């Protein structure tokens, strides 16, 4: 387990605006099979190495890949406040998981 992940940290954002979620896995040459993006316990999106990006039907109208190797979550609501996760699925290293916290203001 030589790798680590740098995230967007802890960010605040205004209600009704956009936000960018980003993670970077450094310190390993491992295969990255798939990244799962979660809002708390709910699946937001997956980026699969072979088959690309797929957006959950619960977020298609406001979640878009990019910029970079992350997501843009639009039309923010106060209930979007909370934890966010970027779960890296790797070979042979295993499963690294990064955390972001987002607070939606007013």
């Amino acid at each position: 387990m030589t790798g680590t992940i740098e995230t967007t940290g802890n960010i605040s954002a205004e209600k009704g605006g956009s936000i960018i979620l980003q993670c970077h896995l450094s310190s390993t040459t491992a295969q990255v099979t798939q990244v799962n993006w979660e809002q708390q316990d709910q699946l937001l999106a997956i980026c699969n190495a072979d088959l690309g990006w797929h957006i959950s039907p619960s977020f298609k109208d406001r979640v878009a890949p990019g910029p970079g190797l992350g997501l843009t979550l639009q039309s923010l609501t106060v209930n979007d406040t909370g934890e966010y996760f970027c779960i890296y699925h790797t070979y042979p290293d295993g499963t690294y998981t990064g955390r972001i916290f987002l607070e939606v203001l007013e």
Partner: antibody
Amino acid sequence: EVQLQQSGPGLVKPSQTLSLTCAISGDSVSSNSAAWNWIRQSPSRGLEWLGKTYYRFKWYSDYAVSVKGRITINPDTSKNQFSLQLNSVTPEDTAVFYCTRESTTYDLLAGPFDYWGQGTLVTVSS
Amino acid sequence: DIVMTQSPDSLAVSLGERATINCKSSQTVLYSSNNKKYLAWYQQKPGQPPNLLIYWASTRESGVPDRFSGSGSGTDFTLTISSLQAEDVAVYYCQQYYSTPFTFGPGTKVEIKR
């Protein structure tokens, strides 16, 4: 084709729990390219989606707001099935309940319902 | 939620004639990235579950006779039966699988005029 075989009692007393199982043949409940759904149909409300469970390196679920708090859909990997539990039923829950496979082969998180169970008529009555 | 409507509520067509039915979604279900329309059509006969006929708005499911076809824009859809057969009497539903919760139209009943 996939076969979906439903079982479970149809008659449920008001305020008690409905429990149905869908046994899968010809696919795996953990398949990366499917999601396992429950639908209900009644003369009053037509066809309505209730919930789904699916595995994308990890088990996920989604439930309709009209049953949130009362509904659980759990996979059983050893028996290759998935179940429905609906708590605190009222006569509004009387309907035909269907399990179905959602085929998510091109969009990994969305697709049509390509195979269906035979349906279980559920009657909420004392 | 997305609301699906259908028209007409019922139709009666002579044996061998063309039957067409309409569906509308209250928002677009065309996803620009893959250019797919997230729309399905089902057939349901009495006592049976719905049976998938068309998905991606215009792709016919395998085993479905080729007299069944679909087309549409991002919001308005049509299911056409080119030559109505006696065994085609049933209720036909459309359904979006674009956003949660997935939702169904109210159904159009298709009958034979004789």
